[PDB]
């Protein structure tokens, strides 16, 4: 696959640097790389595709070497260069499509798609050009056992999950208390509600906790913590836990007090932030414990006193919320982002040719189901397909 990246990089440099009028001093090294690629690929043969609707294609290479005598590139040069470049771009595109549709339970990182398996041979070691892009760099730094890292902007680490826990409930659903939460993308959004407004809680302080177990550790995470979870901040009616009836939720938002955000790694508190909103930093963490509290207002205007009665009806229900946005982070295992197109590209090239549902990846590459259980086989296959996706996106847009 490193050789595949080298092909992609040298064709990208051919398409960019070899332009009409350039000095040959600008492209001497690139032309040498291109001629090495041509010589190595000449006389070989490749078969690509044959899974789903991806057609079988035969590639046979026999091309003339690019000239090197010219002092200053002219229009004659770029025509021959373009003729060769188009074929090579098509070949690399098809090889990447094949490899990113294939899939394997066992030995995921190894190359499928026998074209790429051939490219992994010994003849094609001379084409290795350089490995600078982030994904191939992580690929090599992981092939040799060394720590790797991908920087992610808005990493969708949380699988989509909107739900609620009721620590106190009745069939009438008239006096409830508990938490609700939506974890989606890089958003945690959790609102603890109490219908009695902590009337009978000890010291008129209800206590709420919410755990969120990351499927993979995050590093150097910049986070944005705000109060007043906006999702759970308007009236709703919610189907019951069983699914039989529906209960009414009518929030009035108290301020959350003595909030503690604890970022945990292996159960050990790595960081703690008490009542510190705005941007925050988590150096390294695998789990998040958000603890907040609903304290009854000791003093009360007549209006708010009318809002909170001592009797049963409770026409309004107190609520206190938090919102936590992982603005950016660093992670070892590959993920999906709001800044990178690799997940969408892989899913698109799978959907294009009607590839049948495979062993490890869920049907349709539903990222929520892929991240909800993230087995090492899935991790290996996902890194492989994402690396090929980046290699392909370096040429095909």
């Amino acid at each position: 696959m490193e050789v595949l990246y080298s092909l992609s990089k040298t064709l990208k440099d051919a398409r960019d640097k070899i332009v009409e009028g350039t000095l040959y001093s600008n492209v001497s090294d690139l032309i040498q790389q291109f001629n090495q690629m041509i010589v190595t690929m000449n006389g070989n043969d490749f078969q690509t595709g044959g899974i789903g609707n991806l057609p079988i294609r035969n590639w046979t290479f026999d091309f003339g070497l690019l000239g090197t005598t010219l002092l200053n590139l002219d229009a004659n040069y770029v025509e021959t260069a373009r003729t060769t470049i188009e074929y090579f771009i098509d070949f690399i595109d098809n090889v990447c499509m094949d490899e990113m549709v294939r899939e394997s339970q066992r030995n995921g990182v190894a190359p499928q798609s026998e074209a790429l398996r051939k490219l992994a041979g010994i003849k094609f070691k001379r084409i290795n050009f350089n490995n600078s892009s982030e994904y191939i760099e992580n690929w090599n730094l992981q092939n040799r056992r060394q720590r790797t890292g991908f920087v992610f902007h808005k990493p969708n680490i949380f699988p989509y999950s909107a739900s609620f826990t009721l620590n106190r409930s009745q069939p009438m659903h008239d006096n409830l208390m508990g938490t609700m939460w939506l974890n989606a993308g890089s958003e945690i959004q959790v609102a603890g509600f109490d219908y009695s407004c902590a009337l009978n809680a000890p010291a008129n302080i209800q206590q709420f906790e919410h755990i969120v177990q990351l499927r993979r550790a995050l590093t150097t995470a910049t986070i944005t913590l705000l109060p007043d979870a906006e999702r759970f901040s308007f009236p709703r009616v919610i189907n019951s836990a069983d699914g039989a009836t529906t209960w009414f939720f009518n929030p009035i938002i108290l301020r959350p007090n003595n909030v503690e955000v604890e970022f945990l790694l292996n159960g050990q508190i790595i960081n703690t932030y008490q009542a510190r909103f705005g941007t925050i930093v988590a150096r390294n963490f695998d789990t998040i414990r958000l603890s907040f509290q609903l304290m009854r207002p000791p003093n009360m205007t007549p209006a708010v006193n009318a809002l909170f009665p001592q009797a049963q009806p409770f026409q309004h229900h107190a609520t206190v919320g938090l919102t936590l946005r992982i603005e950016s982070a660093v992670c070892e295992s590959v993920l999906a982002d709001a800044n990178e197109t690799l997940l969408a590209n892989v899913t698109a090239v799978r959907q294009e040719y009607a590839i049948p549902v495979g062993p490890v990846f869920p049907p349709g590459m539903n990222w929520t189901e892929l991240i909800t259980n993230y087995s090492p086989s899935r991790e290996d296959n996902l890194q492989r397909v994402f690396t090929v996706a980046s290699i392909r996106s370096m040429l095909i847009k």
Binding site: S161, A162, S163, F164, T165, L166, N167, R168, S169, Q170, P171, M172, D174, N175, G178, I238, N239, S240, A241, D242, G243, A244, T246, P309, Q310, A311, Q312, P313
Partner: protein, 276 residues
């Protein structure tokens, strides 16, 4: 089955909620109408219970599921009202000077009171907090409460002198007496006639509705004066003819049952808390 334990339950919000249940709560439960005798007196019939049963059958309730109960009047029905019956409606005609009796009955039969006996002759009884009352039921409940100092001496009343006591209910069939929560009291109430129970107010009884057949919004279930809640089950309908009243109930019986609910304390799921 983990009876008698507060165990949190997690429920999602993507789940598609299930189908209707009116047919179940009709084919299984038992509707139960409590009306005053003056109703039947004006109706001047006696196949009419059967006719109402047939109309309820047209509306869905099986034949044996809708059961009728009479009572001479609200004040007499007030004494030990036990609605041993699955979905209760109480038609309650309103007349002047019975506002407090109506409110007392509404509180008693709409809110689940759990309560313990009181030996008036022996102990001095104190009210804990906002949700504790003493309910006295009988033919003539003349409760005479004498408060007590911190030394157990009367104020405004002499413990040996019944006369100077402070009456708070005279010859009432039902009386929900509320005293200054925090003080010992010595009661005297006619033990041969009227029983008294130290009761306190659990959550609401979601199984009994009250149809005030007469006038204005005068029910105050909450003894607190600041709050005057309008519960869903304290319905109110104008009247000039009991046939029209009953036809309204029959027509909108679906809505009334939607307002009501299965009694929480009757559920098996409440087994080891206060199941009844």
């Amino acid at each position: 089955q983990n009876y008698g334990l507060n165990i949190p339950i997690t429920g999602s919000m993507d789940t598609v909620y299930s189908n209707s249940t009116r047919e179940e709560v009709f084919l299984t439960s038992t509707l139960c109408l409590y009306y005053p005798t003056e109703a039947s007196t004006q109706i001047s019939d006696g196949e009419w219970k059967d006719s109402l049963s047939q109309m309820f059958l047209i509306k869905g309730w099986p034949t044996g599921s809708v059961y009728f109960k009479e009572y001479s009047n609200i004040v007499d029905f007030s004494v030990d009202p036990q609605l041993y019956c699955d979905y209760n409606l109480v038609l309650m005609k309103y007349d002047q000077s019975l506002e407090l009796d109506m409110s007392e009955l509404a509180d008693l039969i709409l809110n689940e009171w759990l309560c313990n006996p009181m030996d008036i002759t022996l102990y001095y009884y104190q009210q804990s907090g906002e949700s504790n009352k003493w309910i006295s039921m009988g033919s003539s409940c003349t409760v005479k409460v004498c408060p007590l100092n911190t030394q157990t001496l009367g104020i405004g009343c002499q413990t040996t002198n019944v006369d100077s006591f402070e009456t708070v209910a005279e010859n009432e069939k039902l009386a929900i007496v509320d005293v200054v929560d925090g003080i010992n009291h010595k009661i005297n109430l006619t033990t041969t006639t009227c029983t008294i129970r130290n009761c306190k107010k659990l959550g609401p009884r979601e199984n009994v509705a009250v149809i005030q057949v007469g006038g204005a919004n005068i029910l105050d279930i909450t003894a607190d004066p600041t709050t005057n809640p309008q519960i869903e089950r304290m319905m109110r309908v104008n009247w000039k003819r009991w046939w029209q009243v009953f036809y309204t109930i029959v027509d909108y019986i679906n809505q009334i049952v939607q307002v009501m609910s299965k009694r929480s304390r009757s559920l098996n799921s409440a087994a080891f808390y206060y199941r009844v």
